[PDB]
Nucleic acid binder design. Structure first.
Lengths: 248, 118, 51, 229
RNA sequence: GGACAUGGGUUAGUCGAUCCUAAGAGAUAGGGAAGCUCCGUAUGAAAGUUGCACGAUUUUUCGUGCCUCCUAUCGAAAGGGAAUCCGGUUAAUAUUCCGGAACCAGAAGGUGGAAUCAACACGGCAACGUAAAUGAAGUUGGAGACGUCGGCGGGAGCCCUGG
RNA sequence: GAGUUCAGCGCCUCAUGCUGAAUCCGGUGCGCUCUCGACGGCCCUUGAAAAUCCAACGGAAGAAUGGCCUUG
RNA sequence: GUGAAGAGUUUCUUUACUUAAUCAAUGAAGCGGAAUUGGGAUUUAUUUCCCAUAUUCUAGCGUUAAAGUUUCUUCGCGAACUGAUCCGCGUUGA
């Protein structure tokens, strides 16, 4: 046969388009100021990052050890306005836009840009309109249980940081794209993954679904988890399939 | 031994110069591109003669690896005339020609006659 | 002017005779002066009230 | 006088720029410095077998300086005095007698690993000083056991460089004392007795003792704080 | 005759390249690979050029003094960019030649007014202005530097029109 | 003083020379091309980087004095 | 590699350590422990059981040290201490 598109997406043509992007949205390096007290920065820019549905915040901080101003690229939370003050550290106030250790926050609080590990600089709840809920704490071998946007429960060390509030950008998926052009423009600044051609519309050399006098898969689209590349197409390791009406 | 920076850098050393026990080349080469190796021969075409008579500029055939700085020096050293400006051209045949304008006090016609290509 | 053309201008043509002249506007300079003075006063009264 | 006004700096978090203090603990040292320090740490922990752990306990200050003081008398000559001795021998060989009346028997400390080992096996060594910092330890790890088996007194001393200094070499792995004068027999015997009081008498107990195995630092401090309650 | 033969013809500090960087290429450290070579570009490197006078007859960049996130390069004749126009001239060259009239960058440094018998100018209630109007590091800001469509207003050239 | 137009004298004319004038006064625009200025609309599209140049905060450093020649 | 428990002269299970080895961050920028310091209850009380923090601000600035006992000898923007407590087997975390 022939190498399928999924196998061909290893890079090259299918790399991300990052020319117009303004920088990675990592929170900050976990330093002495954030570990023992707080540090006050002033947000000065709120900009649109192409390929990202949430605005980015350019925030200026004073370097504790050198005569220099450091600019960060915070993921802007909703309600953030230019010229305001954000506080990052253990002793920071529980205010929207402030960065605090997860273990120092009350249970049930709404946060964003949460770290999976200490010093990770933000891993969870970074997309627009998404957030993480602090479910509970456990002091003995300090660990905090949190609820992820997917609904999963994750245990993180009680020293990881998070931004109080919800990521800005609202509910972006509530508006229909309404046009192939809108979809083209959306994915142009992201990567070369659009448009997509169906496997059943292909030939047997191209896709496992290709061929036949009628456009049909022929075999089950649910493939085993340990499938070789080139045959791992369709519904990989599907626990269930079809329309579901009511479950947890 | 107090270090105020967390980065380590290589300390500066003596870095002494070369004191060879023998010269690699026994004899220094004679200076390439001398005055006789800057000028080949004058150009005596109709256009060159018009330049000499009407513009006080001598048209010379110079080597390909010469520049206006060396052309001026060679012209001064060979014909004892001080140029004012020099223009460099590379002909389609692969050779360089130079338009060397002379000052008012110097006459290109008499210089050309002294050279003997007129 | 183009960035290179500013090198040929005299000093007084590239600025304004004021603090932060040629880098900040008059309103911005005035706001910074008032904000600085008021906050320094707030620091002084905070220290005095602490003592 | 009134214009000299104090201007202190708080130096708190987020208050003022921190002063340029000592940062040697957090310096990213180069590879060789990092390797040698980590090698010392790994040797200090990672419990050592008794054959290698019998080192690291060398002679004390007084015994070592007494051994070196008595060692510095029997230096194995130098090039200049050897040339002088050869010239004198050549002059005497013309008319005078042989070496039986011009040059006396040499009296110097022995050196060289193979030569010292042979002397120990031949029972001709009265004292054996072993360097404690031989980088390939297998060169001398068998020396204390060989000396104990052969009855030769042995002591472990630091600074193989210091051992080689009395030999006029950069480094000597082991030194052997074989022959000395008649007046210094008492002091040599006292040195031997002091050496045997630490090494020879403790050979049996050193064979059953493992070194290393110490954590140290934060681990010890945390263990002490946990044991306090 | 764009054919054949013999000669002649392309002239630049201001036009481009050269400088910078983009997508990318690609050395070095290091790590794979039997190897041709592959990955890798502050990468797990002792990866160093910039800033003060310590000494010096005396009015000056060399030996040291402790530094601090510097860093390979290549990559656009349509991206960014220091600076030239008019008239004339040849058989064939013109922002290049000639005549006239300008501009930019770099190097050194003759005046001159200002201010000082003591410090580095004034004016305007302000926006701000001038013929100068001392300024080392360090830091900050701006220009370079930016999509597309539609209408409105102004200017230059062209078109039209009365003598 | 250039260029253009027109009109005469040398008449083998030669370095192509010489002697004459005019090149003036007005207007117009949903006009064409280019450009500039103030605006408006659209994006789940917000529409390069660097070299280089300028400005600012800050104060490192500087040595005239016999009320008058002399220097930074 | 090193140790602690359960078990029919021996190692099966889980349950502890980090230096092997793995991952992440960084300009390997403040990790750990000690002395005062005021609450704190042992108590006709003894740091004996406990750990405590300086910047919330309003879109300003924050660097090239000031002040201090005392050393030439007080030509000095001189050299040290301190301001900036001391110490260390670990760059930090998992």
């Amino acid at each position: 046969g022939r190498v399928i598109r999924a196998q061909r997406k290893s890079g090259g043509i299918f790399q991300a388009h990052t020319r117009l992007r303004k920088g990675a949205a990592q929170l900050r390096t976990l330093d002495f100021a954030e570990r023992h007290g707080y540090i006050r920065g002033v947000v000065q820019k709120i900009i649109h990052d192409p390929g990202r549905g949430a605005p980015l915040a350019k925030v200026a901080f004073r370097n504790p050890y050198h005569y220099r101003t450091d600019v960060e690229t915070f993921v802007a939370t909703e309600g953030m306005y230019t010229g305001q003050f954000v506080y990052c550290g253990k002793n920071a106030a529980l205010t929207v836009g402030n960065v605090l250790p997860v273990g120092e926050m009350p249970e049930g609080t709404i946060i964003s840009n949460v770290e999976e590990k200490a010093g990770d600089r933000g891993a969870l709840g970074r997309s627009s309109g998404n957030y993480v809920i602090i479910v509970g704490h456990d002091v003995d071998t300090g660990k905090t249980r949190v609820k992820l946007p997917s609904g999963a429960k994750k245990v993180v060390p009680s020293s990881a940081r998070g931004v109080v509030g919800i990521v800005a950008g609202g509910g972006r998926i509530d508006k229909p794209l309404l046009k192939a052009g809108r979809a083209f423009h959306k994915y142009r600044v992201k990567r070369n993954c659009w448009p997509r051609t169906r496997g059943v519309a292909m030939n047997p050399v191209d896709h496992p679904h290709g061929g036949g006098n009628h456009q049909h898969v022929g075999h089950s689209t649910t493939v085993p988890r340990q499938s070789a590349p080139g045959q791992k197409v369709g519904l990989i390791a599907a626990r269930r399939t079809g329309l579901l009406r009511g479950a947890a | 031994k107090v270090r105020t920076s967390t980065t380590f850098r290589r300390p500066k050393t003596l870095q002494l110069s070369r004191k060879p026990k023998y010269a690699r080349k026994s004899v220094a080469h004679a200076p390439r591109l001398d005055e006789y190796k800057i000028i080949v021969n004058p150009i005596n075409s109709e256009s060159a003669m018009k330049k000499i008579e009407d513009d006080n500029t001598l048209v010379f055939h110079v080597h390909l690896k010469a520049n206006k700085f060396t052309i001026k020096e060679a012209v001064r050293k060979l014909y004892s005339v001080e140029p004012v400006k020099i223009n460099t051209l590379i002909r389609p045949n692969g050779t360089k020609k130079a338009f060397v304008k002379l000052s008012a006090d110097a006459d290109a016609l008499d210089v050309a006659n002294r050279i003997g290509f007129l | 002017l183009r960035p290179r053309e500013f090198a040929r201008l005299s000093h007084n043509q590239k600025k304004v005779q004021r603090a932060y002249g040629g880098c900040l506007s008059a309103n911005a300079v005035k706001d910074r002066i008032v904000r600085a003075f008021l906050i320094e006063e707030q620091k002084i009264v905070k220290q005095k009230l602490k003592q | 006088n009134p214009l000299f006004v104090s201007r202190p700096r708080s130096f708190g978090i987020g208050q003022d720029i921190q002063p340029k203090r000592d940062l040697s603990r957090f310096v990213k040292w180069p590879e060789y410095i990092r390797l040698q320090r980590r090698r010392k740490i790994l040797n200090l922990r990672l419990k050592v077998p008794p054959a290698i752990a019998q080192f690291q306990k060398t002679l004390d200050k007084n015994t070592a300086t007494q051994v070196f003081k008595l060692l510095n008398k029997y230096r194995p000559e130098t090039a200049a005095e050897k040339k002088q001795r050869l010239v004198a021998e050549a002059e005497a060989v013309a008319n005078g007698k042989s070496a039986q009346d011009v040059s006396k028997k040499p009296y110097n400390v022995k050196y060289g690993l193979n030569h010292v080992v042979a002397l120990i096996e031949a029972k001709k060594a009265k004292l054996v000083l072993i360097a404690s910092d031989v980088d390939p330890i297998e060169l001398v790890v068998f020396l204390p056991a060989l000396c104990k088996k052969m009855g030769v007194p042995y002591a472990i001393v630091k600074n193989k460089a210091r051992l080689g200094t009395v030999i006029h070499q950069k480094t000597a792995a082991v030194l052997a004392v074989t022959e000395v004068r008649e007046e210094d027999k008492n002091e040599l015997a006292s040195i031997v007795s002091a050496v045997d009081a630490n090494f020879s008498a403790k050979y049996d107990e050193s064979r059953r003792k493992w070194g290393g195995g110490i954590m140290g630092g934060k681990t010890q401090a945390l263990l002490a704080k946990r044991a306090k309650a």
